Ligand binder design. Structure first.
Ligand SMILES: O=c1ccn([C@@H]2O[C@H](COP(=O)(O)OP(=O)(O)O)[C@@H](O)[C@H]2O)c(=O)[nH]1
Ligand SMILES: OC[C@H]1O[C@@H](O[C@H]2[C@H](O)[C@@H](O)[C@H](O)O[C@@H]2CO)[C@H](O)[C@@H](O)[C@H]1O
Ligand SMILES: [Mn+2]
Length: 287
């Protein structure tokens, strides 16, 4: 029975948003007591899962770097299982894993459009959660492969449902957010509504919550297809619609998924993960 005050101190970061109107903490460097959390979770003997997809040239361009960095920085001190989804297992980079890390790898069907490869992840993750992840871990994170861990990404990020603030918009107002604005889409968020602009590159929670996130998001994806419309920012638009309707119990600051192209302002004290430079001309095969 862990209590927020037991590990979260918002006063440590007075210059940023540390609490939502629905009482959810926004985890910033300096606000968390990882030692207290590590002991707490270690006593419960938790295991944390991490899913990552790599289809096409994303495999050669990002998978090794992602996995090598995850091995070194993700939930260190706790049992972790990496779930790798690739369309070609023969191109799977097999790196050496460290203490408390293991993995499995699954061959998936490569969708023709990169937009569907990104969106289909929602369906696939749900299938795997029901098939086995729900029986293997206490918490699960789903991440994009085009990024790299830079420092400790630990238990301070765990929660029922966890959302990530997108680096470029954490200081902007909702009406400036690139939410889906067409009412015909299931991801529609009207102007005048919205809390934050979440990044689909990182989200997680308990297997139960993530199953609901991926389900619902995929239902919206399929609905739009039936109405001959596709969200401008695909699964990210749908994920934002979901988190608006079902508020996350925990949010991570941009320090947990930073884009160095922005530079490094005062608010970003310690980067835990950074974006890989975009290389669409090579890794994507369609507009
Ligand atoms: O052809 C593709 C398109 C997408 N993805 C996966 O889906 C995520 C979403 O895509 P991307 O990173 O290209 O989205 P962006 O962050 O640039 O919007 C990627 O990180 C990959 O894990 C993939 O493996 N192959
Ligand atoms: O808007 C969703 C979309 O943002 C891309 O990042 C943009 C950012 O939104 C824009 O404000 C800035 O000027 O340029 C960035 C491109 O580097 C993300 O790359 C994309 O994945 C989505 O998250
Ligand atoms: Mn990405």
């Amino acid at each position: 029975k862990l209590k927020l005050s037991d590990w979260f101190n918002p006063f440590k970061r007075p210059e940023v948003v540390t609490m939502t109107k629905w009482k959810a903490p926004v985890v910033w460097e300096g606000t968390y007591n990882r030692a207290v959390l590590d002991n707490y979770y270690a006593k419960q003997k938790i295991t944390v899962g991490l899913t990552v997809f790599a289809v096409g040239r994303y495999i050669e361009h990002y998978l090794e770097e992602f996995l090598t960095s995850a091995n070194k920085h993700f939930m260190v001190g706790h049992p972790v299982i990496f779930y790798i989804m690739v369309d070609d297992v023969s191109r799977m980079p097999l790196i050496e894993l460290g203490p408390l890390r293991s993995f499995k790898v699954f061959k998936i069907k490569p969708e023709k459009r990169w937009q569907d490869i990104s969106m289909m992840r929602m369906k696939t993750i749900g299938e795997h959660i029901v098939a086995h992840i729900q029986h293997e871990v206490d918490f699960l994170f789903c991440m994009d492969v085009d990024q790299v861990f830079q420092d400790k990404f630990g238990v301070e990020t765990l929660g029922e449902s966890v959302a990530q603030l997108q680096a470029w918009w954490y200081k902007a107002d909702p009406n400036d957010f690139t939410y889906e604005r067409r009412k015909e889409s299931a991801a529609y968020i009207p102007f005048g509504e919205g809390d934050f602009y979440y990044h689909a590159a990182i989200f997680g929670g308990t297997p139960t919550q993530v199953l609901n996130i991926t389900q619902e998001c995929f239902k919206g994806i399929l609905k739009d297809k039936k109405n001959d419309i596709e969200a401008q920012w695909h699964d990210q638009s749908h994920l934002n619609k979901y988190f608006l309707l079902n508020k996350p119990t925990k949010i991570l600051s941009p320090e947990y998924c930073w884009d160095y192209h922005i530079g490094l302002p005062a608010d970003i004290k310690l980067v835990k993960m950074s974006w890989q430079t975009k290389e669409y001309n090579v890794v994507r095969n369609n507009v």
